[PDB]
Protein backbone atom coordinates (compact mmCIF):
# COMPACT_ATOMS: atom_id res chain seq x y z
CA UNK A 1 0.00 0.00 0.00
CA UNK A 2 2.70 2.52 1.00
CA UNK A 3 5.46 3.44 -1.43
CA UNK A 4 8.25 6.01 -1.30
CA UNK A 5 7.32 6.82 -4.95
CA UNK A 6 4.34 8.78 -3.53
CA UNK A 7 6.59 11.89 -3.46
CA UNK A 8 6.35 11.94 -7.29
CA UNK A 9 2.51 11.84 -7.15
CA UNK A 10 1.91 14.33 -4.29
CA UNK A 11 3.61 17.40 -5.84
CA UNK A 12 1.34 20.35 -4.86
CA UNK A 13 -0.32 21.50 -8.13
CA UNK A 14 -0.88 25.00 -6.68
CA UNK A 15 2.93 25.49 -6.73
CA UNK A 16 2.82 25.11 -10.55
CA UNK A 17 1.86 28.35 -12.33
CA UNK A 18 -0.57 27.63 -15.21
CA UNK A 19 0.05 27.15 -18.05
CA UNK A 20 3.54 25.86 -17.38
CA UNK A 21 6.36 26.97 -19.73
CA UNK A 22 6.93 23.39 -20.95
CA UNK A 23 3.24 23.11 -22.02
CA UNK A 24 3.48 24.32 -25.59
CA UNK A 25 0.95 24.32 -28.47
CA UNK A 26 2.86 21.48 -30.17
CA UNK A 27 1.88 19.22 -27.21
CA UNK A 28 -1.51 20.65 -26.11
CA UNK A 29 -4.69 21.77 -27.82
CA UNK A 30 -6.54 25.04 -27.18
CA UNK A 31 -8.86 23.30 -24.63
CA UNK A 32 -5.89 22.68 -22.29
CA UNK A 33 -5.07 26.38 -22.07
CA UNK A 34 -8.66 27.10 -20.94
CA UNK A 35 -8.13 25.28 -17.62
CA UNK A 36 -7.92 27.81 -14.80
CA UNK A 37 -5.13 26.15 -12.84
CA UNK A 38 -2.85 23.13 -12.77
CA UNK A 39 -5.15 21.57 -10.15
CA UNK A 40 -8.17 21.87 -12.48
CA UNK A 41 -6.27 20.10 -15.29
CA UNK A 42 -5.04 17.36 -12.93
CA UNK A 43 -8.51 16.77 -11.54
CA UNK A 44 -9.96 16.39 -15.11
CA UNK A 45 -7.05 14.04 -15.98
CA UNK A 46 -7.96 11.94 -12.86
CA UNK A 47 -11.61 11.74 -14.06
CA UNK A 48 -10.53 10.53 -17.57
CA UNK A 49 -7.98 7.94 -16.44
CA UNK A 50 -10.45 6.60 -13.76
CA UNK A 51 -12.78 5.48 -16.60
CA UNK A 52 -13.33 1.89 -17.68
CA UNK A 53 -10.65 0.94 -20.25
CA UNK A 54 -10.01 -2.64 -21.36
CA UNK A 55 -6.33 -3.45 -22.23
CA UNK A 56 -7.10 -3.10 -25.98
CA UNK A 57 -8.66 0.43 -25.65
CA UNK A 58 -5.60 2.71 -25.92
CA UNK A 59 -7.31 4.45 -28.92
CA UNK A 60 -10.47 5.36 -26.88
CA UNK A 61 -8.31 6.62 -23.99
CA UNK A 62 -6.22 8.78 -26.37
CA UNK A 63 -9.44 10.21 -27.86
CA UNK A 64 -10.84 11.06 -24.41
CA UNK A 65 -7.52 12.69 -23.34
CA UNK A 66 -7.78 14.87 -26.47
CA UNK A 67 -11.49 15.79 -26.02
CA UNK A 68 -11.57 16.30 -22.24
CA UNK A 69 -8.05 17.44 -21.27
CA UNK A 70 -6.63 18.91 -24.52
CA UNK A 71 -3.62 16.57 -24.74
CA UNK A 72 -2.61 15.95 -28.39
CA UNK A 73 -3.07 12.34 -29.53
CA UNK A 74 0.55 11.81 -30.59
CA UNK A 75 1.74 13.10 -27.19
CA UNK A 76 -0.71 10.85 -25.21
CA UNK A 77 0.46 7.89 -27.34
CA UNK A 78 4.14 8.67 -26.64
CA UNK A 79 3.41 9.04 -22.89
CA UNK A 80 1.45 5.76 -22.76
CA UNK A 81 4.38 4.02 -24.46
CA UNK A 82 6.99 5.32 -22.01
CA UNK A 83 4.73 4.35 -19.07
CA UNK A 84 4.51 0.72 -20.43
CA UNK A 85 0.71 1.34 -20.52
CA UNK A 86 0.40 1.96 -16.74
CA UNK A 87 -2.40 4.55 -16.58
CA UNK A 88 -1.77 5.15 -12.86
CA UNK A 89 1.56 6.88 -13.74
CA UNK A 90 -0.15 9.50 -16.12
CA UNK A 91 -0.65 12.10 -13.36
CA UNK A 92 2.92 11.61 -12.20
CA UNK A 93 4.14 12.29 -15.76
CA UNK A 94 2.44 15.69 -15.98
CA UNK A 95 3.22 16.85 -12.43
CA UNK A 96 6.92 16.11 -12.89
CA UNK A 97 7.03 17.45 -16.47
CA UNK A 98 5.46 20.68 -15.31
CA UNK A 99 7.45 21.09 -12.08
CA UNK A 100 10.81 20.28 -13.75
CA UNK A 101 10.08 22.15 -17.02
CA UNK A 102 11.44 19.10 -18.92
CA UNK A 103 9.71 16.62 -21.24
CA UNK A 104 9.92 13.74 -20.53
CA UNK A 105 10.80 13.98 -16.84
CA UNK A 106 14.22 12.24 -16.75
CA UNK A 107 14.45 10.78 -13.22
CA UNK A 108 10.99 9.55 -12.26
CA UNK A 109 10.07 5.95 -11.30
CA UNK A 110 7.70 4.47 -13.88
CA UNK A 111 8.68 6.89 -16.67
CA UNK A 112 10.99 5.12 -19.09
CA UNK A 113 13.41 7.40 -20.92
CA UNK A 114 15.47 6.63 -24.04
CA UNK A 115 18.55 6.23 -21.79
CA UNK A 116 16.66 3.78 -19.56
CA UNK A 117 15.67 1.64 -22.57
CA UNK A 118 19.32 1.62 -23.74
CA UNK A 119 20.44 0.53 -20.23
CA UNK A 120 17.87 -2.28 -20.34
CA UNK A 121 19.31 -3.72 -23.57
CA UNK A 122 22.95 -3.12 -22.57
CA UNK A 123 23.61 -6.50 -20.75
CA UNK A 124 25.60 -4.35 -18.17
CA UNK A 125 25.31 -5.32 -14.44
CA UNK A 126 25.86 -1.70 -13.19
CA UNK A 127 23.34 -0.15 -15.63
CA UNK A 128 20.73 -2.80 -14.72
CA UNK A 129 21.35 -2.15 -10.96
CA UNK A 130 20.68 1.60 -11.45
CA UNK A 131 17.72 0.86 -13.66
CA UNK A 132 16.03 -1.50 -11.15
CA UNK A 133 16.76 1.01 -8.37
CA UNK A 134 14.76 3.57 -10.42
CA UNK A 135 11.86 1.45 -11.69
CA UNK A 136 11.98 -1.79 -9.70
CA UNK A 137 12.13 -5.40 -10.82
CA UNK A 138 8.46 -5.71 -11.73
CA UNK A 139 8.57 -2.76 -14.13
CA UNK A 140 11.90 -3.93 -15.57
CA UNK A 141 10.43 -7.38 -16.33
CA UNK A 142 7.35 -5.77 -17.95
CA UNK A 143 9.59 -3.53 -20.10
CA UNK A 144 11.62 -6.55 -21.24
CA UNK A 145 8.39 -8.38 -22.21
CA UNK A 146 7.38 -5.28 -24.30
CA UNK A 147 10.73 -5.44 -26.16
CA UNK A 148 10.44 -9.25 -26.60
CA UNK A 149 6.92 -8.86 -28.13
CA UNK A 150 8.11 -6.05 -30.52
CA UNK A 151 5.84 -3.45 -28.88
CA UNK A 152 8.68 -0.83 -28.65
CA UNK B 1 -2.18 1.70 -30.64
CA UNK B 2 -0.67 -1.76 -29.77
CA UNK B 3 0.54 -0.68 -26.26
CA UNK B 4 -1.83 -2.56 -23.90
CA UNK B 5 -3.11 -0.42 -21.00
CA UNK B 6 -3.80 -1.22 -17.35
CA UNK B 7 -4.32 0.23 -13.84
The 3-class secondary structure across chain A, one letter per residue, is: CCCCCHHHHCCCHHHCCCCCCCCCCCCECHHHHCCCCHHHHHHHHHHHHCCCCCCCCHHHHHHHHHHHHCECHHHHHHHHHHCCCEHHHHHHHHHHHHHHCCCCCCCCCCCCCHHHHHHHHCCCHHHHHHHHHHHCHHHHHHHHHHHHCCCC
User: Are A96 and A39 in the same domain?
Assistant: yes
Which of A52, A74, A85, A86 to probe by mutation at the B interface, max B CB count within 10 Å? Answer: A85
Instruction: Compare all CA atoms of chain B with the CA of A59 and give the residue at the minimum distance.
Output: B1
Instruction: Compare all CA atoms of chain A with the CA of B2 and give the residue at the minimum distance.
Output: A151
Resolution to 1 decimal, in Å? Answer: 1.6
Q: What method did the depositors use to determine the structure?
A: X-ray
Q: Distance of CA A35 to CAs A20, A60, A61, A86, Å?
A: 12, 22, 20, 25
Distance from CA of B3 to the nearest CA of A (A): 6
CB atoms A85 and B4 under 8 Å: yes
Degrees to nearest 5, angle at CA A63 with A59 and A66: 140
CB atoms A151 and B3 under 8 Å: yes
Q: Cα-flanking dihedrals φ and ψ of residue A147, to 5°?
A: -65, -40
User: Are A52 and A89 in the same domain?
Assistant: yes
CB atoms B5 and A55 under 8 Å: yes
CATH number for the domain harbouring residue A52: 1.20.120.1480
Residues contacting A133, CB < 8 A, separation 6+ = none
User: Are A74 and A15 in the same domain?
Assistant: yes
User: Are A85 and A130 in the same domain?
Assistant: no
CB atoms B1 and A80 under 8 Å: yes
User: Are A83 and A12 in the same domain?
Assistant: yes
Q: Which residues of A94-127 are buried (b: 16+ CB within 10 A; e: fewer)?
A: bbbbbbbeebbbeebbbbbeeebbebbeeeeeeb
User: Are A79 and A151 in the same domain?
Assistant: no
User: What DSSP designation does B7 have?
Assistant: -
User: Domain range for residue A141?
Assistant: 103-152
Per the structure, the count of domains in chain A is: 2
- Identify the burial level of A46 via C-beta atoms within 10 angstroms of its C-beta, where 0-12 means exposed, 13-18 middle and 19 or more buried: exposed
Amino acid sequence: DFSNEDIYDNIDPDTISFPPKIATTDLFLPLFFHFGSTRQFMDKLHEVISGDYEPSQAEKLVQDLCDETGIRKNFSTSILTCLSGDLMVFPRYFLNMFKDNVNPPPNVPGIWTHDDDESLKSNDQEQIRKLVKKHGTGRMEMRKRFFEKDLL
Amino acid sequence: IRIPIFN
